[PDB]
């Protein structure tokens, strides 16, 4: 099983290639990591395994979900430390994902009810609804287009949050630049309609993710920085006319950051849509090797994500399409997913109803082990 | 095994509940049924089993795949007859699926290179491809929105083809009203942007499928007509803002057609969604497998008659669906491609041949068509 052959991720020696994908679960009451998060990550931690945390706030304006953790206050860093300590006691490596939702927020989630910030003034369309603090779903409001001068202020929030993460004991950080959130709102030409130096051409649209990665790379070192992109995922109206060229342009910038710093990033993390069920239709399979194309052009560690199974993950590693395989949904309901992939044992099903609830046990830590 | 308890599908008494799902295979060279189809359907026919044919053209404008069979010419009728006879010789029941692709076509498939017809002028998005006659995967073009008289012309094509089907010996026909093809392009508010009496509200959007079903029911009788739909589907941009209400509106129409005709349709056939949610919140999308099951059972409980489910089913999922009352029959597609004796394999709980997607749509009369081995 090539999923359990050791792999050196920069300076971290991993014993296997099964990775916990970042997953918002909304158990961090009041934006403060709670003891429940420790038991949740401790359950899934393994000796020499790689874990990525749920998206974590970098500032008071970056949230678009209820009760998601932040890492922009020393109070939050102190709570994260207790969680990271428990995870390191099991021998796992843990990165914290730095998450800013941009226009994918609501006044109820913003201080003083301010409008969310984004690259554009265009709101997410009515085809998408935001989970509200009362369990209902509401409308995405019109965001405020941040001025050219303000982009460096947001970059500074990433930089400070990476430093707070190191202060909490995290091994590294992952930049959340996928799924139509703030960074993807600058990448995709279906959203970025800016006239300034951050909009228009492909090179300009990659300016934002570049300065963000450069800022955290300089602060804590490249080998502690991972980057997650989703060029071909249309979530929250975040479509690009040419996902291939966008992906390659990002890879080009990432290779350049590594060449300038003289160090390789922790990894590149690319996620794709799950077309598992398109085989039962007449035309679902007619006609995109983007994953392999980006893997071929990138210099360093590649984590593939999106609809991967035990058999698909094995094939991906044995084929060389990726070095590590991250699992989301399966990890929600299978705390010992690593061992289950080892033994090829049956997997538990997940319950969508408790993805985003606040119970510290129900649907969170009560999925059974083998 | 509840799958092998008999079932009375109207006037047809079936011996088991394993159904051959309709599957385009592209072996009907020049749109004429070929001897290969006879051997293909013969291999899968069982005594008292139900078969549904590949989607079959109702008119020269109805195709969006290469070498798909027609049933709108008398030559096609004569060739189908030979195939139905071999199936009937094995004691099987066989329906012919009537299929119009509408905007899911290309100029290379249309008479005189004309534009495909549809409810709208909007083309299928760049996320989808069409199979071209040379095996390449191409881009769907802009269709032509058709008017009221032309719509009635299409209904007449369905009606004439229904009559040809029974003249060829078929036990009945299935209306293909799923997967974003012509009927679904009228049903789904994600496709139908019309402002006339065929677009807008749910009532207007269900007008076309209602007229098609009524025409064929009046022509050959209700108990020889089945209807297939897919209210929650990504295929070919066939999204709807409220798949549940759309599905119930259709069921209401079918129930009323049955009451007015004093007879019941052969069945309602509903396909599972071709997608699985990932925690997202998109209008018109089912958020979980549990909501998916509730959708299907709600349509089943609403329809006055036989219910066939399809889409990713296995032996275990098919037993459960029948045991739990979720469906009366279960149709299998890909597993039937690679397992000509799938019925016996389900019965014996035997291993199943893998299928080769390569050869689903090639034109070879044997390779990947009739060369899958028996037990
Ligand atoms: C409930 C839930 C929460 C998620 N939260 C995040 C997140 O905070 N950050 C992120 O980058 N991806 C997030 N994801 C996406 C996962 O990483 C996703 O499941 C993965 O990209 C696809 O892998 P899978 O097929 O194994 O589920 C989330 C997914 C789910 C279902
Ligand atoms: C190759 C192929 C061709 C198909 N052709 C048709 C068709 O012509 N008409 C139709 O209504 N469905 C068609 N379908 C959908 C199937 O009838 C059925 O809904 C699907 O195969 C069920 O899923 P399963 O293969 O997992 O059993 C086709 C499916 C496949 C895979």
Tell how far CA A51 is from the center of its chain.
12
Tokens describing residue B176? 């293909």
3-state SS assignment for residue B103? coil
Measured CA to CA, the distance from residue B311 to residue B318 in angstroms comes to 11
How far apart CA B200 and CA B192 sit, in angstroms, is 7
DSSP state of B209: H
Q: Catalytic pick from A140, A181, A298, A367?
A: A181
Q: Which of B58, B157, B152 is nearest to B98 (CA)?
A: B58
Most distant CA pair in chain B: distance in Å? 56
* Cβ pair A357, A363 in contact under 8 A: yes
Neighbouring CB atoms inside 10 A of B148's CB total: 10
3-state percent helix, strand, coil for chain A, nearest multiple of 5: 40, 15, 45
Contacts of B112 (CB under 8 A, 6+ apart): none
Residues in chain B: 375
Experimental technique: X-ray
Angle at A345 between CA A342 and CA A348, to 5 degrees: 115
Question: Strand pairing partners for A303?
Answer: A269, A324
The CA–CA distances, whole Å, from A241 to A31, A118, A231, A297, B178 equal 36, 20, 10, 20, 29
Question: What are chain A's domains?
Answer: 2-354 (3.20.20.70)
* Rounded-to-integer distance, Cα B209 and Cα B217, Å: 12
Q: Tokens in use for B41?
A: 């359907």
**In angstroms, rounded to a whole number, what is the distance separating the alpha carbons of residues A34 and A52?**
17
Phi and psi, residue A155, nearest 5°:
-55, -40
* Token pair of B328 as six digits: 């009366």
Backbone angles phi, psi at B189, to 5 degrees: -70, -10
Please state the φ and ψ torsions of residue B337, each to the nearest 5 degrees: -60, -50
Tokens of A3: 């999923």
> After which residue numbers is chain A interrupted with C–N beyond 2.5 angstroms?
287
Pairing of strands A137-138, B307-310: unpaired
Q: Residues with Cβ < 8 Å from B259, sequence gap 6 or more?
A: none
Alpha-carbon gap, residue B21 to B332, rounded angstroms: 5
Selection from A142, A144, A104 nearest residue A123 by Cα: A142
- Rounded to 5°, the CA angle B96-B272-A364 comes to 170
- Sign of the CA dihedral running B322, B324, B328, B329: negative
> Could you give the CA distance from residue A279 to residue A283 in angstroms, rounded to a whole number?
8
Cβ atoms of B216 and B162 within 8 Å: the answer is: yes
The Cα B318–Cα B329 span in angstroms is 8
Choose among A174, A295, A190: nearest CA to A238: A190
Q: Which of B236, B279, B280 sits opposite A283 (nearest CB)?
A: B236
Give residues with Cβ within 8 angstroms of A23, minimum separation 6: A54, A328, A331, A332
Token output for A159: 């930089």
How far apart (Å, rounded) are the C-alpha atoms in residues B124 and B145? 13
Take residue B257 and report the two structure tokens written for it: 């057609």
Helices of type H across B235-276: 243-261
Ligand nearest, relative to CA of residue A230: 1
| Cβ atoms of A248 and A231 closer than 8 Å | no
Long-range contacts, A128-132 (Cβ 8 Å, 24+): A128/A236, A128/A237, A128/B281, A128/B282, A128/B283, A129/B281, A129/B283, A130/A64, A130/A104, A130/A105, A130/A106, A130/B281, A131/A65, A131/A66, A131/A356, A131/B281, A132/A66, A132/A106, A132/A108
- Helices in chain A by DSSP H: which ranges? 35-44, 74-89, 151-168, 182-187, 202-205, 207-220, 243-261, 290-297, 310-319, 329-333, 337-343
To which residue do tokens 């089943």 refer? B300
Which residue of chain B has the CA closest to A239? Answer: B127
Helical (H) or strand (E) element with B43: helix B35-44
Residues B69 and B28 sit within 8 Å (Cβ to Cβ) = yes
- Closest CA relative to residue A93, chosen from A102, A84, A83, A101: A84
Measured distance CA(A16)–CA(A50) in Å, rounded: 8
Q: Which residues does ligand 1 sit against, CB inside 6 Å?
A: A 21-24, 54-55, 97, 99, 176, 178, 228, 271, 274, 305-308, 327-330, 355; B 278-279
| Alpha carbons B259 and A343: distance in angstroms, whole number | 57
Structure tokens at B83: 């195939």
Instruction: Give the separation between CA B95 and CA B53, rounded to whole angstroms.
Output: 6
Distance, CA of A58 to CA of A350 (rounded, Å): 29
B161: number of CA atoms within 13 Å, CB side? 31
Given in angstroms, what resolution was this structure solved at?
Answer: 1.8
Using CB atoms within 10 A of its CB, is residue B182 exposed (0-12), middle (13-18) or buried (19+)? buried
Dihedral of the alpha carbons of A270, A272, A274, A278, in degrees to the nearest 10:
-140
Kindly tell me the sign of the dihedral angle through the C-alpha atoms of A56, A61, A67, A73. positive
- Torsion angle defined by CA atoms of residues A115, A116, A117 and A123, in that order, rounded to the nearest 10 degrees: -90
List the structure tokens of A291.
Answer: 């994953």
Tell me the CB-side half-sphere exposure of residue A353, using CA atoms within 13 A.
4
Considering only CA atoms, give the Rg of chain B: 19
- For tokens 């799902």, the residue is B21
Number of neighbouring beta carbons within 10 Å of residue B129: 16
Query: Rounded to whole angstroms, how far apart are CA atoms B297 and A160?
Result: 52
Alpha-carbon span A192 to A205, nearest angstrom: 7
Q: How far is CA B264 from the centre of its chain?
A: 19
CB-based contact A285 B333, cutoff 8 Å? no
- Best mutation site among B275, B276, B277, B278 for ligand 1 pocket (most ligand atoms within 8 Å of CB): B278
Rounded Cα distance between A13 and A220, Å, is: 19
B129–A contact, CB cutoff 8 A = yes
Q: What is the DSSP letter of B70?
A: B
Structure-block tokens of residue B304: 């006055």
Mutate to test the pocket of ligand 1, among A18, A20, A23, A104 (most ligand atoms within 8 A of CB): A23
How far is residue B305's CA from residue B219's CA, in Å, rounded to a whole number? 20
Which residues, in sequence order, are bridge partners of residue B322? none
Six-digit token string for A327: 């699992």
Nearest alpha-carbon partner for A75 in A61, A57, A92, A94: A57
Q: What is the DSSP string of A262-288?
A: TS--SEEEEE----GGGGGSSSTT---
If you take atom 5 of ligand 1, which residue's CA is the nearest one?
Answer: A23
CB within 8 Å of B337: residues ≥ 6 apart: B23, B25, B355, B360, B372
Q: Report the C-alpha gap between B84 and A294 in whole angstroms.
A: 51
**B226 C-alpha to ligand 2 centroid (Å):** 16
Paired with A12 in beta bridges are: A9
For A154, the 3-state DSSP assignment is helix
């Amino acid at each position: 099983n090539p999923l359990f052959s050791p792999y050196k991720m920069g300076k971290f020696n991993l014993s296997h290639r099964v990775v916990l994908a970042p997953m918002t679960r909304c158990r961090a009451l009041n934006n403060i990591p709670q003891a429940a998060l420790g038991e949740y990550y401790e359950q899934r931690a393994t000796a020499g395994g790689f874990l990525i945390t749920e998206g974590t706030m970098i500032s008071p304006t970056s949230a678009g979900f209820p009760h998601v953790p932040g890492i922009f206050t020393k109070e939050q860093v102190r709570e994260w430390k207790k969680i990271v300590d428990v995870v390191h006691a099991k021998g796992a490596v843990i990165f914290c994902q730095l998450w800013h939702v941009g226009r994918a927020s609501h006044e109820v989630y913003q201080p003083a009810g301010a409008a969310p910030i984004s690259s554009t003034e265009k709101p997410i369309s009515n085809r998408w609804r935001i989970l509200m603090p009362d369990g209902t779903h509401g409308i995405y409001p019109k965001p405020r287009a941040i001025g050219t001068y303000e982009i460096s202020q947001v970059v500074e929030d990433y930089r400070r949050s990476a430093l707070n993460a190191i202060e909490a004991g995290f091994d590294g950080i992952e930049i959340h630049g996928a799924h139509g959130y703030l960074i993807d709102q600058f990448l995709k030409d279906g959203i970025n309609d800016r006239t300034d130096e951050y909009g228009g051409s492909l090179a300009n649209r990659c300016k934002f993710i570049t300065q963000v990665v450069q800022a955290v790379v300089s602060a804590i070192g490249a080998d502690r920085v991972g980057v997650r992109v989703s060029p071909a995922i249309d979530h929250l109206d975040a479509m690009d006319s040419n996902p291939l060229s966008l992906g390659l342009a990002v890879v080009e910038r990432l290779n350049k950051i590594q060449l300038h710093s003289g160090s390789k990033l922790a990894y590149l993390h690319v996620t794709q849509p799950d077309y598992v069920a398109y085989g039962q239709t007449e035309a679902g399979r007619l006609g995109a090797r983007l994953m392999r194309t980006l893997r071929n052009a990138y210099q360093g560690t590649f984590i593939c994500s999106g609809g991967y199974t035990r058999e698909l993950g094995i094939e991906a590693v044995a084929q060389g399409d990726a070095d590590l395989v991250s699992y989301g949904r399966l990890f929600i309901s299978n705390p010992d997913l690593v061992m289950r992939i080892k033994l090829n044992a049956p997997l538990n099903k997940y319950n969508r109803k408790t993805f985003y609830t606040q119970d510290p046990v129900v649907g969170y830590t009560d999925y059974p082990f083998l």
